[PDB]
Short mmCIF file of C-alpha atoms and ligand atoms in Angstrom, two decimals:
data_model
loop_
_atom_site.label_atom_id
_atom_site.label_comp_id
_atom_site.label_asym_id
_atom_site.label_seq_id
_atom_site.Cartn_x
_atom_site.Cartn_y
_atom_site.Cartn_z
CA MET X 1 118.70 112.32 108.54
CA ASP X 2 118.15 111.28 112.14
CA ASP X 3 116.95 114.70 113.10
CA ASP X 4 113.50 113.99 114.52
CA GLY X 5 111.49 116.53 112.52
CA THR X 6 110.33 118.60 115.53
CA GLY X 7 112.39 121.70 114.85
CA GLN X 8 110.76 125.00 114.04
CA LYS X 9 109.64 125.47 110.46
CA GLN X 10 108.12 128.05 108.16
CA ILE X 11 106.03 127.16 105.10
CA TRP X 12 105.25 129.44 102.17
CA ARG X 13 103.19 128.79 99.06
CA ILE X 14 104.29 130.15 95.70
CA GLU X 15 101.61 132.62 94.58
CA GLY X 16 102.44 134.40 91.33
CA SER X 17 105.99 135.62 91.74
CA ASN X 18 105.92 135.69 95.59
CA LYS X 19 106.13 133.18 98.41
CA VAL X 20 103.11 133.64 100.74
CA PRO X 21 103.04 132.39 104.35
CA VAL X 22 100.84 129.35 104.78
CA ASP X 23 98.37 129.37 107.72
CA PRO X 24 100.44 127.70 110.51
CA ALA X 25 97.34 125.88 111.70
CA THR X 26 97.36 123.97 108.36
CA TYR X 27 101.05 122.95 108.04
CA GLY X 28 100.97 119.41 106.65
CA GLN X 29 98.12 120.21 104.26
CA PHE X 30 99.04 121.18 100.71
CA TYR X 31 97.27 121.89 97.38
CA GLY X 32 98.59 119.45 94.74
CA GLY X 33 98.11 122.27 92.26
CA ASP X 34 100.76 124.43 93.95
CA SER X 35 104.46 124.67 94.78
CA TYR X 36 105.80 125.25 98.26
CA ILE X 37 108.93 126.24 100.15
CA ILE X 38 109.67 124.93 103.60
CA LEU X 39 112.46 126.44 105.73
CA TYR X 40 113.21 123.96 108.53
CA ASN X 41 115.49 124.82 111.44
CA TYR X 42 116.85 121.95 113.46
CA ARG X 43 119.42 121.07 116.13
CA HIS X 44 120.87 117.61 116.10
CA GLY X 45 123.98 115.92 117.47
CA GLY X 46 124.56 119.23 119.24
CA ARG X 47 124.79 121.31 116.02
CA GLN X 48 122.23 123.75 114.54
CA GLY X 49 121.29 123.66 110.86
CA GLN X 50 118.66 124.53 108.26
CA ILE X 51 117.14 122.79 105.28
CA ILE X 52 115.10 124.36 102.55
CA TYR X 53 112.69 121.87 101.04
CA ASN X 54 111.15 122.91 97.70
CA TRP X 55 108.00 120.84 97.27
CA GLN X 56 106.28 120.79 93.85
CA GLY X 57 102.67 119.57 93.75
CA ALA X 58 101.77 117.10 90.98
CA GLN X 59 99.66 119.71 89.19
CA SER X 60 101.80 122.77 89.86
CA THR X 61 102.44 124.70 86.69
CA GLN X 62 105.74 125.44 85.03
CA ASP X 63 105.39 129.11 85.86
CA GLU X 64 105.14 128.29 89.60
CA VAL X 65 108.15 126.05 89.33
CA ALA X 66 110.13 128.86 87.69
CA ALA X 67 108.91 131.24 90.39
CA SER X 68 110.07 128.93 93.21
CA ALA X 69 113.52 128.72 91.70
CA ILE X 70 113.84 132.50 92.02
CA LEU X 71 112.25 132.53 95.47
CA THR X 72 114.51 129.81 96.80
CA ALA X 73 117.65 131.54 95.51
CA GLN X 74 116.54 134.71 97.21
CA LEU X 75 115.89 132.92 100.48
CA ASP X 76 119.21 131.16 100.29
CA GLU X 77 121.02 134.43 99.71
CA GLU X 78 119.04 136.05 102.50
CA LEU X 79 120.19 133.27 104.83
CA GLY X 80 123.87 133.64 103.87
CA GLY X 81 124.14 130.51 101.74
CA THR X 82 123.99 128.27 104.82
CA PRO X 83 120.98 126.06 104.29
CA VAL X 84 121.01 122.57 102.83
CA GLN X 85 118.79 122.49 99.68
CA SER X 86 116.51 119.66 98.58
CA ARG X 87 114.04 119.70 95.68
CA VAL X 88 111.16 117.29 96.00
CA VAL X 89 108.18 116.42 93.76
CA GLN X 90 104.85 115.15 95.14
CA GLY X 91 105.03 111.48 96.07
CA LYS X 92 108.84 111.40 96.29
CA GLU X 93 109.21 112.95 99.74
CA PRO X 94 112.12 111.69 101.92
CA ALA X 95 111.18 110.29 105.31
CA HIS X 96 112.58 113.35 107.07
CA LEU X 97 110.17 115.69 105.23
CA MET X 98 107.23 113.43 106.03
CA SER X 99 108.21 113.59 109.74
CA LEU X 100 107.92 117.37 109.92
CA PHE X 101 104.14 117.25 110.71
CA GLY X 102 104.29 115.55 114.10
CA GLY X 103 103.13 112.16 113.00
CA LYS X 104 100.24 113.52 110.92
CA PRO X 105 99.78 112.44 107.32
CA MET X 106 100.64 114.81 104.49
CA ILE X 107 97.26 115.82 103.02
CA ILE X 108 97.11 116.91 99.40
CA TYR X 109 94.01 118.74 98.13
CA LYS X 110 92.89 119.05 94.54
CA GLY X 111 93.12 122.54 93.10
CA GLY X 112 95.15 125.43 94.41
CA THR X 113 95.88 128.95 93.20
CA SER X 114 96.96 130.67 90.01
CA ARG X 115 97.61 134.18 88.73
CA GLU X 116 94.63 134.01 86.39
CA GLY X 117 92.14 132.27 88.64
CA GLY X 118 93.11 132.80 92.24
CA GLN X 119 92.27 130.18 94.89
CA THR X 120 89.94 127.34 93.88
CA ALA X 121 87.07 126.45 96.20
CA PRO X 122 86.72 122.94 97.74
CA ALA X 123 84.19 120.66 96.04
CA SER X 124 81.00 119.83 98.05
CA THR X 125 81.63 116.06 97.87
CA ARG X 126 85.25 114.92 98.12
CA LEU X 127 87.17 111.69 98.13
CA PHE X 128 90.69 111.08 99.45
CA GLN X 129 92.91 108.01 98.91
CA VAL X 130 95.04 107.33 102.01
CA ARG X 131 98.17 105.36 101.48
CA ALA X 132 101.20 104.64 103.58
CA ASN X 133 104.51 103.15 102.54
CA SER X 134 106.39 100.35 104.28
CA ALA X 135 108.09 102.82 106.58
CA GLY X 136 104.74 104.24 107.66
CA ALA X 137 104.87 107.65 106.00
CA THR X 138 101.22 108.43 105.08
CA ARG X 139 99.67 110.52 102.32
CA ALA X 140 95.97 111.43 102.00
CA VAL X 141 95.50 112.47 98.34
CA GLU X 142 92.22 114.00 97.10
CA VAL X 143 90.83 112.33 93.94
CA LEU X 144 87.56 112.43 92.02
CA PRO X 145 84.61 111.22 94.10
CA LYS X 146 83.41 108.29 91.97
CA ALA X 147 83.15 104.60 92.91
CA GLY X 148 85.75 103.74 90.25
CA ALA X 149 88.40 105.67 92.19
CA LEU X 150 88.44 103.21 95.08
CA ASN X 151 91.10 100.57 95.46
CA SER X 152 91.11 97.62 97.81
CA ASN X 153 94.62 98.24 99.09
CA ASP X 154 93.98 101.60 100.81
CA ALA X 155 91.62 103.50 103.13
CA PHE X 156 89.45 106.23 101.67
CA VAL X 157 87.62 109.20 103.20
CA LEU X 158 84.43 110.36 101.48
CA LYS X 159 82.93 113.62 102.73
CA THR X 160 79.61 115.06 101.55
CA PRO X 161 77.51 118.02 102.73
CA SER X 162 75.52 115.53 104.78
CA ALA X 163 77.79 112.64 105.73
CA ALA X 164 81.31 111.25 106.06
CA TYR X 165 82.59 107.75 105.50
CA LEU X 166 85.91 106.10 106.27
CA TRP X 167 86.10 103.21 103.79
CA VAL X 168 88.62 100.58 104.57
CA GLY X 169 89.94 98.47 101.76
CA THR X 170 90.58 94.79 102.57
CA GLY X 171 94.30 95.35 102.12
CA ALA X 172 94.49 98.70 104.01
CA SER X 173 96.98 98.97 106.95
CA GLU X 174 96.40 100.48 110.37
CA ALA X 175 98.59 103.40 109.40
CA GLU X 176 96.19 104.14 106.55
CA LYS X 177 93.20 103.79 108.79
CA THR X 178 94.87 106.17 111.28
CA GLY X 179 95.79 108.71 108.63
CA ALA X 180 92.18 108.61 107.41
CA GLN X 181 91.05 109.45 110.93
CA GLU X 182 93.43 112.41 111.12
CA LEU X 183 92.19 113.68 107.75
CA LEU X 184 88.65 113.44 109.11
CA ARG X 185 89.75 115.58 112.04
CA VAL X 186 91.01 118.27 109.65
CA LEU X 187 87.71 118.07 107.72
CA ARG X 188 85.83 118.38 111.06
CA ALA X 189 83.58 115.41 110.29
CA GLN X 190 82.51 112.29 112.15
CA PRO X 191 82.60 109.21 109.96
CA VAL X 192 80.60 106.15 109.42
CA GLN X 193 83.22 103.32 109.38
CA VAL X 194 82.74 101.11 106.34
CA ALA X 195 84.59 97.91 105.54
CA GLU X 196 85.10 97.04 101.88
CA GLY X 197 82.33 94.67 100.93
CA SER X 198 79.69 95.84 103.39
CA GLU X 199 79.11 99.35 102.17
CA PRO X 200 75.70 100.84 103.01
CA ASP X 201 73.59 102.23 100.14
CA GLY X 202 74.23 105.79 101.35
CA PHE X 203 77.92 105.33 100.52
CA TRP X 204 77.48 104.32 96.88
CA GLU X 205 74.83 107.06 96.46
CA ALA X 206 77.23 109.71 97.71
CA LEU X 207 79.67 108.55 95.02
CA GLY X 208 77.09 108.86 92.28
CA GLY X 209 76.34 105.17 92.12
CA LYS X 210 77.90 101.79 92.74
CA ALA X 211 80.49 100.66 90.18
CA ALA X 212 83.51 98.41 89.69
CA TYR X 213 86.73 99.81 91.07
CA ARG X 214 90.43 99.06 91.43
CA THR X 215 90.85 95.60 92.88
CA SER X 216 92.67 92.31 92.32
CA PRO X 217 93.91 89.47 94.55
CA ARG X 218 97.17 91.35 95.15
CA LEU X 219 95.56 94.74 95.93
CA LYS X 220 93.32 92.98 98.50
CA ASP X 221 96.24 91.41 100.36
CA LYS X 222 97.08 93.12 103.68
CA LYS X 223 100.53 91.53 103.84
CA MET X 224 102.76 92.98 101.10
CA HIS X 227 107.21 91.75 97.35
CA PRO X 228 105.89 95.37 97.23
CA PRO X 229 105.03 96.32 93.61
CA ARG X 230 107.97 97.65 91.66
CA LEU X 231 107.69 99.89 88.61
CA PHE X 232 110.80 99.56 86.37
CA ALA X 233 111.79 102.11 83.77
CA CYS X 234 112.13 100.92 80.19
CA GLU X 245 113.39 100.96 89.08
CA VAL X 246 111.26 103.92 90.17
CA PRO X 247 111.57 104.76 93.93
CA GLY X 248 108.98 106.60 96.04
CA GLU X 249 105.20 106.38 95.66
CA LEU X 250 103.97 105.14 92.25
CA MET X 251 102.74 108.20 90.46
CA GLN X 252 101.00 108.50 87.08
CA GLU X 253 103.76 110.93 86.03
CA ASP X 254 106.28 108.05 86.42
CA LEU X 255 104.82 106.45 83.30
CA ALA X 256 107.04 107.63 80.46
CA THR X 257 104.63 108.22 77.55
CA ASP X 258 107.41 107.80 74.99
CA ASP X 259 108.58 104.54 76.59
CA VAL X 260 107.41 101.15 77.83
CA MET X 261 107.33 100.42 81.59
CA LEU X 262 107.09 97.24 83.66
CA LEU X 263 104.97 96.99 86.81
CA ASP X 264 105.67 93.77 88.77
CA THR X 265 102.96 93.03 91.35
CA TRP X 266 104.47 89.58 92.02
CA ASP X 267 101.64 87.40 90.76
CA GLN X 268 101.60 89.44 87.59
CA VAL X 269 103.81 91.60 85.41
CA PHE X 270 102.19 94.44 83.48
CA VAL X 271 103.86 95.81 80.37
CA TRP X 272 102.67 99.45 80.10
CA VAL X 273 102.96 100.89 76.60
CA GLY X 274 103.34 104.62 76.18
CA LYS X 275 101.38 106.19 73.30
CA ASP X 276 104.61 107.51 71.80
CA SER X 277 106.83 104.45 72.41
CA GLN X 278 108.31 102.87 69.26
CA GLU X 279 107.20 99.32 68.32
CA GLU X 280 110.54 97.79 69.17
CA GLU X 281 110.34 99.06 72.77
CA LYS X 282 107.35 96.82 73.36
CA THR X 283 109.12 93.81 71.84
CA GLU X 284 112.25 94.26 73.92
CA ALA X 285 110.18 94.87 77.05
CA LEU X 286 108.13 91.73 76.49
CA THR X 287 111.31 89.71 76.00
CA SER X 288 112.73 91.26 79.16
CA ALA X 289 109.61 90.57 81.25
CA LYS X 290 109.75 86.86 80.34
CA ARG X 291 113.41 86.77 81.34
CA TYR X 292 112.90 88.88 84.48
CA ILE X 293 110.31 86.36 85.63
CA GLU X 294 112.72 83.54 84.97
CA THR X 295 115.79 85.12 86.52
CA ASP X 296 114.17 84.98 89.95
CA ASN X 299 111.45 81.41 93.09
CA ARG X 300 108.12 81.96 91.30
CA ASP X 301 105.74 80.33 88.78
CA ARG X 302 106.26 80.11 84.98
CA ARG X 303 102.56 80.87 84.58
CA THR X 304 103.17 84.39 85.85
CA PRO X 305 100.93 86.35 83.49
CA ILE X 306 102.55 89.14 81.50
CA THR X 307 99.70 91.55 80.82
CA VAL X 308 100.10 94.22 78.14
CA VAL X 309 98.33 97.50 78.76
CA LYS X 310 98.28 100.67 76.67
CA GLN X 311 98.38 104.26 77.84
CA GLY X 312 94.89 105.58 78.50
CA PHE X 313 93.33 102.13 78.44
CA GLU X 314 94.70 100.77 81.72
CA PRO X 315 92.60 98.20 83.59
CA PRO X 316 91.64 98.81 87.28
CA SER X 317 93.98 96.00 88.42
CA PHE X 318 96.84 98.15 87.17
CA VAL X 319 95.64 101.64 88.13
CA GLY X 320 94.98 100.57 91.70
CA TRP X 321 98.78 100.52 92.45
CA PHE X 322 99.03 104.25 91.78
CA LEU X 323 98.70 107.02 94.22
CA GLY X 324 95.70 108.95 92.98
CA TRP X 325 95.22 108.56 89.24
CA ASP X 326 93.73 111.20 86.95
CA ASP X 327 91.70 109.84 84.01
CA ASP X 328 92.42 113.03 82.11
CA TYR X 329 96.08 113.30 83.05
CA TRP X 330 97.05 112.98 79.39
CA1 CA Z 401 98.90 126.40 91.27
CA1 CA Z 402 97.68 100.44 101.13
CA1 CA Z 403 111.03 105.71 73.47
#
């Protein structure tokens, strides 16, 4: 879609059974715990059109999803059945949707709203993982504020009641550094720039203590054979939900192939997958000493988890 993303748009958040207008000053910022509807009006190649994007946050509940279905059908009917429809889950946004916020990164907060609990309040200390894809689309995703959440391939923003830090992983790109800066703007905080490896003591303290985190030779490399996750190939950002718990998945990071074993995958799926990995590495050229590392659901090592966009240790 060559439309440039600058058309007029309206964004609503599913709240209970209704769609509620989102504060226009915050378009581009979303709660991962919620579902949203975006009505985008555009004019391109001399013709006017509309697109309804249904965006489902990674933690949005099934009842919100069911509510959006009703809301979107109503909107569509209201509009005379003219808009183009596109359903999108967090992390799988098309380039055109990412372009709707004038170059700003899509920011995804933890929490959200619910019938039973209403709107959650922001935590006092927060950490955001900022990652951009090859095309440059950038996402700032809030995660738990612990040292273990860091990964060398991205930029991170840590905000506390008393300080802000922009941590730059060794493999982070300028797009990630720039998105981090924009996020800091939204958070109204001035950061202390920190390069991975020369963190001041105040940074580790804010995170509750220094600890090992997600790193490896590949995660540290700025360059980037981008890692591919193959189903028992998964496009978009690598999300924890892409790991089929009843199956076995392969994550190829070039100098290493991980064999991820779902808790409910049958024994034979691991066997086949291992056989396949060996062959995959020999189909090609590379090295025959390419390690094939087996990992089990819930016991993933940091060198594996680092490739994911914002992992939740309790996800399962
Ligand atoms: Ca919600
Ligand atoms: Ca990165
Ligand atoms: Ca299976």
